[PDB]
Amino acid sequence: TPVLKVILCGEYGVGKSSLFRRFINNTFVPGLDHFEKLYQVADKDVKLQLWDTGGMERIASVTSSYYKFAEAAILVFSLDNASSFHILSQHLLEIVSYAENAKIFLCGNKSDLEGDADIETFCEQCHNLVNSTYKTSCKTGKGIEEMFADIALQRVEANRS
Ligand SMILES: Nc1nc2c(ncn2[C@@H]2O[C@H](COP(=O)(O)OP(=O)(O)O)[C@@H](O)[C@H]2O)c(=O)[nH]1
Ligand SMILES: [Mg+2]
Ligand SMILES: [Mg+2]
Ligand SMILES: [Mg+2]
Numbered sequence: 001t002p003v004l005k006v007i008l009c010g011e012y013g014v015g016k017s018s019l020f021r022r023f024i025n026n027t028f029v030p031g032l033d034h035f036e037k038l039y040q041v042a043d044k045d046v047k048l049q050l051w052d053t054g055g056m057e058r059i060a061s062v063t064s065s066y067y068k069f070a071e072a073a074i075l076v077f078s079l080d081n082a083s084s085f086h087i088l089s090q091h092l093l094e095i096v097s098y099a100e101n102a103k104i105f106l107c108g109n110k111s112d113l114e115g116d117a118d119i120e121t122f123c124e125q126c127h128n129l130v131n132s133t134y135k136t137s138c139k140t141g142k143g144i145e146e147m148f149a150d151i152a153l154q155r156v157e158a159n160r161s
Contacts, residue, residue, distance in 0.1 A: 003036065003047040004155055005069055009091040010076035012058045014084050015109035018138035019076060020052040023148065028139055039152040046156055048148065067098035072155055076107040079114035079135065092125060103155055106133040107147065112140055 008016040021027055024035050034051045051070075056062050067073075073095045077084035095102060106121060108114075121133055131154055134147040 001038070001045045001047055002159070003049050004071040004152075004159075005049045005051065006072040006074060006151065007051045007066060007070045007095075008053060008074050008076060009088075009095060010057070010107075011084050011087050011091075012055075014076045014078045014081075015136075015138050016076050017052055017055075019074075019107070019109065019136065019144065020050060022138055022141060022144045023050050026141055026145075028141070037148075039149070039156075041153050041156040044156050044160065046152055048152055062094070064098050067095050070095070070099045070102050072103040072105060072151060073099070074105045074107050074151070076109055077118070078110045079108045079118060080110055080116050082116065082118055085118045088124065092129075103131050103151075103158065104129050105147075105151055106130055108133065108135040109138060111135045111137040111142060 008020060010016055018028065021029065023037065033054050034049050036047050036049045038045060038047050051066065053062055075088045075091055077088060092104065121130065124130065132150060134143055136143040136147055
């Protein structure tokens with residue numbers, strides 16, 4: 001079964017490590033850089049290899065090997081902080097530079113602390129670079145399992161086409 005690499009991108013403090021923890025175990029706490037999980041979508045089984053930055057985005061020392069050979073990139077931003085959504089342009093630039101033809105997904109984390117703005121992605125990038133957007137909350141787990149399931153489904157469908 002194929003192994004598809006999914007990287008977590010975004011600024012420091014949006015909830016990338018919390019999403020990574022939720023992936024490994026459905027846990028929230030107020031290890032390794034990558035974790036593999038097996039999904040079956042219809043006929044095809046795929047192993048999603050989710051990567052976390054390891055806190056290296058705090059010193060802006062995310063190496064180019066983090067983006068290389070990435071089948072997908074999840075741009076995570078906090079729904080209560082509008083700067084985290086504005087700063088995604090640099091991360092998308094690095095992704096495209098080191099891994100073109102990569103599926104870009106958008107994650108709006110901390111949906112329990114928004115009630116800020118960022119209600120419209122407003123075509124952050126064109127030519128349908130964004131495959132789909134998601135609103136998650138690592139504290140309550142809302143929309144996380146659905147997000148990863150839909151990501152696996154979309155990339156199985158894309159690799160079959
Ligand atoms: N309420 C709420 N808090 C969150 C959520 N995700 C993360 N946090 C909080 O944000 C803090 C830092 O998040 P962190 O995992 O370090 O994000 P990262 O460093 O960007 O990967 C943690 O202490 C969490 O308690 C969420 O979905 N909802
Ligand atoms: Mg982190
Ligand atoms: Mg970085
Ligand atoms: Mg800031």
